[PDB]
């Protein structure tokens, strides 16, 4: 819950990243970085230092699921909490996401309340 926790917000849509960034700020998290897609996210994650990933599901080059699978398979990123944030909510994804090891799942549009809830349960289930 260290409000210093570095978040990587991944979404191919600028406005959405802005919204998420601001919802995090409202919650007290100001250490937020943005990525445009899975590849751009990985390029940035290699630089280490990130403690939480909020990733959109649909993005070009490399979508959310693939990013999650890639993170979970990488020794160094393996334990990175990953919260899927998608507009949809198909049962298949939820299943795939969970199977791949998604730390949580949220349907946009969402409120700081909903986010806070999800972030809390994840910080809890883990240790932060």
């Amino acid at each position: 819950a260290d409000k210093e926790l570095k978040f990587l917000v991944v979404d191919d849509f600028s406005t959405m990243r802005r919204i998420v960034r601001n919802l995090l700020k409202e919650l007290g998290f100001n250490n937020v970085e943005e990525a445009e897609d899975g590849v751009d996210a990985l390029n940035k994650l290699q630089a280490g230092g990130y403690g939480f990933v909020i990733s959109d599901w649909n993005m070009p080059n490399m979508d959310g699921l693939e990013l999650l699978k890639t993170i979970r398979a990488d020794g160094a990123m393996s334990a990175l909490p990953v919260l899927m944030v998608t507009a949809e909510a198909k049962k298949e994804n939820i299943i795939a996401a969970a199977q791949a090891g998604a730390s949580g799942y949220v349907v946009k549009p969402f409120t700081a309340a909903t986010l806070e809830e999800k972030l809390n349960k994840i910080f809890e289930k883990l240790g932060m």
Binding site: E88, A89, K90, K91, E92, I94, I95, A97, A98, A102, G104, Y105, V106, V107, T114, K121, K125
Partner: peptide
């Protein structure tokens, strides 16, 4: 099965 779930249902099959 393209079926949109409620947030409540996502929390039920996720955890």
């Amino acid at each position: 099965g393209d079926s949109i779930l409620s947030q409540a249902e996502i929390d039920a099959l996720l955890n």
